[PDB]
Amino acid sequence: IERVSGKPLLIGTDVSLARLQKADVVAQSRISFPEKELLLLIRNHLISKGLGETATVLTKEADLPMT
Amino acid sequence: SICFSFRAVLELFDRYDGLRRLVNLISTLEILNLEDQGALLSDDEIFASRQTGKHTCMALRKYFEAHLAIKLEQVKQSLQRTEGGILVHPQPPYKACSYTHEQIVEMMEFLIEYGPAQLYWEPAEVFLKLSCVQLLLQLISIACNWKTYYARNDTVRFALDVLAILTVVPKIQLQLAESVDVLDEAGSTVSTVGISIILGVAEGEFFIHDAEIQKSALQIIINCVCGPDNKSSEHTLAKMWNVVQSNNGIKVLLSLLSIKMPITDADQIRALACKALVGLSRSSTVRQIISKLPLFSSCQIQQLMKEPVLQDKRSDHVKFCKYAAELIERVSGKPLLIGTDVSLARLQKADVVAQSRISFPEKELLLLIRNHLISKGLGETATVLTKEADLPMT
Amino acid sequence: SALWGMKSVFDMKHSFTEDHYVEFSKHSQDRVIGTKGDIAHIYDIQTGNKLLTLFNPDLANNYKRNCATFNPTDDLVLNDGVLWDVRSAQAIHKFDKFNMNISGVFHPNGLEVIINTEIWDLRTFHLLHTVPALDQCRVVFNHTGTVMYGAMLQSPFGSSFRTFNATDYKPIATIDVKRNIFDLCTDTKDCYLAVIENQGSMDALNMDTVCRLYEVGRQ
Amino acid sequence: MEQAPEDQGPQREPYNEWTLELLEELKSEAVRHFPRIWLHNLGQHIYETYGDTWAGVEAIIRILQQLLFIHFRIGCRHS
């Protein structure tokens, strides 16, 4: 199964042939994302779990859309 | 058989004796009188008498095919009452027998299950006070073995269609087991329940090459096992669960779930087989029994991946997969309509992984937050994050 | 069927003209049961009368080879795949038919019922297990009840053996006996297998059926 | 120390008569389960090869009881 297909490197996952060409493309994809989509989640975490005296200090490092 | 379309014909029919004149024609018949079947043997009183019973089964068919649409008008207008209906009825003579047993006379038998649950037909109570569903059971049993082509294929095919329209009454499903006065191929008076005859027709032990008769048989089962959710009417469905399971039912349905010899309607027999299981797998005993059989060891998925007749692939094999996914859901740990890891060993994995209680301390995230913010340049909160929590690494 | 005598004098000490398969009672051997068709008769040995004939017409499975047996506590009978409490002549629980031939047997633990390939319970009546290698084979247990033997009854009959475990039903061995196995009995003291095998090809006109003794546990 | 029991069972001293008391009976059941085509043909096949010499007389009671056992063993109700 390994030789006639898209070369799984000895991982036991989705052994069917239609599911094998899925896992080649998903693993070799180039996932990227901007920094904003994380820093707004970092700030919305730190305000939530009480630890807030870096949140108004995080406004110094980046724009803050939501108070 | 043609004039039952006009509703004025049917109205005058019950104004006279009607089925008292019509059922008495069947109860006169000498092919059916087992006490007198070995007296007359000439071909004139047999070839015509096995034809007289043929046409009267079609007359009873076209009778109850019409009254099924008469009382459906008295349910879609009496219960809905403008909620999905229009109240326009000047009583015209109109042909409304719906004319399609393949699609819509089948469909009216399903949609009547939103009925009153205390249904009361004059076409039912006149039938059962005569108590000739036992007669119709005897019509099946005697016509099992003629082997001489007196159109006996049709004579049982019309006879099963008279049953399946009647079975929407709850009190007649109860009499598919009680009255047992029958006869079989031993040349001997025996006694057995009605369901075993119907399940026998579904197998192919009798009526060997016949195909529509099997689909006519399976409709009688589905009307008794795939009913409504609703101490008494639930007990009535459970009593039918107890009778259908007792008379070797679960062997038959698994045999029809892999039928391959009638390759034209092999898809239609399997979907009507699997719909009977999904109804019957709401019985508490049957949940455990079907859970250990080799249907749920493997090859349930292999009946849903081969796609045997590709002409019904977007038509009828896709609906066999619809009824079969509901059977996998019921006998297992309840996936809430998510298509994931459909195998049974992989299904109990996903129940535990989804219901686990994942927890983690706050430290394991805040050290990752700080190690991110120092990494991507934005560092004048990191020494401010030391104010909020201990920092192990500079 | 004839209850003979083997002390020193050989005589039909009681005679039956009816039953196709007679069988003792297991623990207290004073009872002999036998079955014709779907009707199973309980006999005594002392007087040979019919003690209690048990049958329910509303409930039988009508197996092809019905053989009513006893549990090792001498209280339950498998006639037609129906249990029977022999204290008051009543039926207990019909099973579901699946295989058209075999009416079942008791497992020596007194906890289960082995219909052809379906393993049942005696008090909860739940299908515990399903061993597909038990497809139409007659079963013989050890005297201790620790292993199950299997001989195919498929036309050929028994192209091999089938060695099973009595606890988890895991297959131990299928030793290939090239001839056709017709019957199989084992020791009480676990040393030999009495094996009726047929020589030649599958010939119904010429049958050379010999007995070949095996030894347990030797290469 | 096992003493095999004394054979005081049903003896068969008129073997020329007990055969005749049962060779009809071997024919009295094979016709009740099988057509007479093989019955006369196998009886002729041994009579061309064993004749009237008792070496077909017991030998047909061999072959008939060897088939009527296995035909009640393979799983045919009559045949």
From Swiss-Prot, chain C:
Ranges of the WD repeats in the UniProt entry: 16-53, 55-87, 88-130
State the source organism's domain of life: Eukaryota
Q: Subcellular location, in the record's words?
A: Cytoplasm; Nucleus; Cytoplasm, Cytoskeleton, Microtubule organizing center, Centrosome
UniProt modified residues of type Phosphoserine: 155
Region feature (WD repeat-like region): 1-130
Question: What positions carry the motif DWD box 2?
Answer: 118-125
In chain numbering, motif DWD box 1 lies across 82-89
**Tissue specificity:** Ubiquitously expressed.
Q: Which residues form the signal peptide?
A: none
- What induces or represses this gene? Up-regulated in a number of cancer cell lines (at protein level).
Q: How does it assemble?
A: Component of the DCX (DDB1-CUL4-X-box) E3 ubiquitin-protein ligase complex, named CUL4A-RBX1-DDB1-DCAF1/VPRBP complex. Interacts with DDB1; the interaction is direct. Also forms a ternary complex with DDA1 and DDB1. Interacts with NF2 (via FERM domain). Component of the EDVP complex, a E3 ligase complex containing DYRK2, EDD/UBR5, DDB1 and DCAF1. Interacts with DYRK2; the interaction is direct. Interacts with RAG1; the interaction is direct. Interacts with LLGL1 and LLGL2. Interacts with histone H3. (Microbial infection) Interacts with HIV-1 virus Vpr protein; the interaction is direct.
Quote the record's domain comment. Answer: The protein kinase-like region mediates the threonine-protein kinase activity.
Family listed? Belongs to the VPRBP/DCAF1 family.
* Purpose of the protein: Acts both as a substrate recognition component of E3 ubiquitin-protein ligase complexes and as an atypical serine/threonine-protein kinase, playing key roles in various processes such as cell cycle, telomerase regulation and histone modification. Probable substrate-specific adapter of a DCX (DDB1-CUL4-X-box) E3 ubiquitin-protein ligase complex, named CUL4A-RBX1-DDB1-DCAF1/VPRBP complex, which mediates ubiquitination and proteasome-dependent degradation of proteins such as NF2. (Microbial infection) In case of infection by HIV-1 virus, it is recruited by HIV-1 Vpr in order to hijack the CUL4A-RBX1-DDB1-DCAF1/VPRBP function leading to arrest the cell cycle in G2 phase, and also to protect the viral protein from proteasomal degradation by another E3 ubiquitin ligase. The HIV-1 Vpr protein hijacks the CUL4A-RBX1-DDB1-DCAF1/VPRBP complex to promote ubiquitination and degradation of proteins such as TERT and ZIP/ZGPAT.
- Protein's UniProt name: DDB1- and CUL4-associated factor 1
Write the gene name: DCAF1
